[PDB]
A = this chain, B = another copy of it.
Amino acid sequence: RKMAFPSGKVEGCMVQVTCGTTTLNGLWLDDVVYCPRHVICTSEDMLNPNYEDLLIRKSNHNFLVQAGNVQLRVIGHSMQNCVLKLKVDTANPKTPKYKFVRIQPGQTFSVLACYNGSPSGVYQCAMRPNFTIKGSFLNGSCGSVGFNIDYDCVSFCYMHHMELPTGVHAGTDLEGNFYGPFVDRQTAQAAGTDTTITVNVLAWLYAAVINGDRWFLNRFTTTLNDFNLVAMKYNYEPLTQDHVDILGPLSAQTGIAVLDMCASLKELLQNGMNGRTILGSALLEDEFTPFDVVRQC
């Protein structure tokens, strides 16, 4: 079962930010509200916004920040890459211990999808190798954030900005830098060709075994390089030695050498599933990291 972090610590930071007729979500940490800068845009701006030029023309009072049944007065604004930082005259008492991090492709995080500053749902995602993410984001979800929770500390890693024509999504870290070659203008943008996160597919196979499902296994083996040759043929990420090291615990917990599971996965890529399923799924799932699998088993 694909599992997200309890979202309560993030829910208490979500506020509604409005500029003109655009409304989206902001993240209220301490006395700063973070949100996507394209909130300041209009139609005649969306296509080629000179954001520095549009921002200087804005006043503290053009920003209506509403937290619940209360407006927060903006007493300053600044821009950092594609995120807009609005200073407010109040501090969020519910601010949790947090940090801002930029995650790598193949890493996973939970997403608190929000509309008009109100949480609506949470789910688990991975940073695809092509720096998109496959989310469930509708109009008004912008400003929703992705995060991980280690101990009592919230590592924010993503803020939502756009949906690509293919239906995947693009966004920035909380420093405002996009993941991938995307731009916050209203233009149709294609991504690089995506690939499957092999070390996550292997972690997930190990999980199906831990849960008493071993039909995909086989008595064969493979070298790492020979496996990566096949893996890349099928547009699967290469497996590094660190990837093998990271899989050690699952290899141990199950007595299935990593390279043996690579042989299994190799057979699956060349043969298919031929009706059969793993952990309910007819597709090879690649949004469970080894760490995700371990914590849950």
Q: A: which residues have CB within 8 A of B? A: 1-12, 112-113, 119-123, 125, 134-136, 167, 211-212, 277, 280-283, 295-296
> From residue A198, how far is it (CB to closest CB) to chain B in Å?
18
Given known contacts A7-B7, A8-B11, A282-B283, A120 and B2 CB-to-CB distance under 8 angstroms: no
Nearest CB on B from A167, distance (A): 7
Q: How far is A5 from B280 in the complex, measured between Cα atoms in Å?
A: 22
Which 7 A-B pairs have CB atoms at the shortest separation, nearest pair first? Answer: A8-B8, A6-B119, A8-B11, A3-B121, A1-B136, A3-B123, A6-B7
B residues less than 8 Å from A11 (CB atoms): 6, 8
The answer to whether B120 touches A1, judged by C-beta atoms less than 8 angstroms apart, is no
Contacts of A167 in B (CB 8 A): 211-212
Least CB separation from A121: chain B residue: B3
| B1, B119, B120, B211: the one within 8 Å of A295 (CB) | B120
Contact B121 A5 (CB under 8 A): yes
Q: Is the CB–CB distance between A122 and B296 below 8 Å?
A: no
CA separation between A4 and B2, bound complex, in Å? 10
Residues from chain B with a CB closer than 8 A to the CB of A10 are: 8
In the complex with contacts A1-B123, A1-B136, A296-B121, A9-B8 CB distance below 8 A: yes
The chain B residue with its CB closest to the CB of A8 is: B8
Instruction: Give chain B residues whose Cβ lies under 8 Å from the Cβ of A281.
Output: 282-283
